[PDB]
Amino acid sequence: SGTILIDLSPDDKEFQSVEEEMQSTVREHRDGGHAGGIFNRYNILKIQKVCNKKLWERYTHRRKEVSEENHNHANERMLFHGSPFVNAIIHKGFDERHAYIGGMFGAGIYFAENSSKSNQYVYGIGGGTGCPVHKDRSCYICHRQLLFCRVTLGKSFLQFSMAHSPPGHHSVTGRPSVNGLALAEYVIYRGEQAYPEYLITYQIMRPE
Numbered sequence: 001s002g003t004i005l006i007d008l009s010p011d012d013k014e015f016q017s018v019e020e021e022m023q024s025t026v027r028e029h030r031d032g033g034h035a036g037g038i039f040n041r042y043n044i045l046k047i048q049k050v051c052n053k054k055l056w057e058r059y060t061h062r063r064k065e066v067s068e069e070n071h072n073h074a075n076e077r078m079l080f081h082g083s084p085f086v087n088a089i090i091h092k093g094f095d096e097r098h099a100y101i102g103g104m105f106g107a108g109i110y111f112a113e114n115s116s117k118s119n120q121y122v123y124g125i126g127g128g129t130g131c132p133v134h135k136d137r138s139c140y141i142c143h144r145q146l147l148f149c150r151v152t153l154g155k156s157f158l159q160f161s162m163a164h165s166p167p168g169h170h171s172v173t174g175r176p177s178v179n180g181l182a183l184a185e186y187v188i189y190r191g192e193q194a195y196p197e198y199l200i201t202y203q204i205m206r207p208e
């Protein structure tokens, strides 16, 4: 596949940086933990840098094209990704051909600035049936994986809660609505506009 995983030590500043972004961007969700479970913190078990030459070159090549179409601005963001396909993504890269046709922003790949938002998608849309072992969306036992990804948004089209980016645009930024979203969500329609830089193995922590 070409993918090498570098285990980061908890004493490493790079580990701590991803760890803090994970913990600090947790919010309380309107569904009261229906989808992602009830927690205010994670047990961070492992952070691995994903190294894949081919996937990196695919990303930077697309990033250059987006920059030239957006006044030499990539609009590059570090965003969380949750889906049941994390292990496929780190080996083969993101693939829009597996995108769900029925989502709020159509057939795109979803990212979030809130780890707890991406956590809701780890076991499927709306948390699916929960963890494969206990069928529990609030499972404190089973180990989850998120990706912390380099994402090229370029010219992002602002929408409330579609097959490709709107004409002239490179992504969609979903925005909070009183009758729609609660938190910012970002959608790309081309897999090569994201690199899965960090693989985070964690549990949601049972609150005291």
Ligand SMILES: CCOc1ccc(-c2nnc([C@H]3C[C@H](NC(=O)c4ccnc5cccnc45)C3)n2-c2ccccc2Cl)nc1
Pocket: 082, 083, 084, 085, 088, 089, 092, 093, 094, 095, 096, 098, 099, 100, 103, 104, 108, 109, 110, 111, 121, 122, 124, 125, 126, 191
């Ligand atoms: C109401 C909330 O709606 C949402 C939220 C998140 C996503 C989403 N965002 N990204 C995805 C996954 C990541 C994409 N898959 C791959 O990049 C991929 C890459 C390589 N191999 C694969 C093999 C099987 C499936 N996917 C792959 C599709 N998904 C996704 C797609 C289908 C099913 C479940 C999810 Cl989480 N879609 C809709």
Ligand SMILES: [Zn+2]
Pocket: 131, 132, 133, 134, 135, 136, 139, 140, 141, 142
């Ligand atoms: Zn479980």
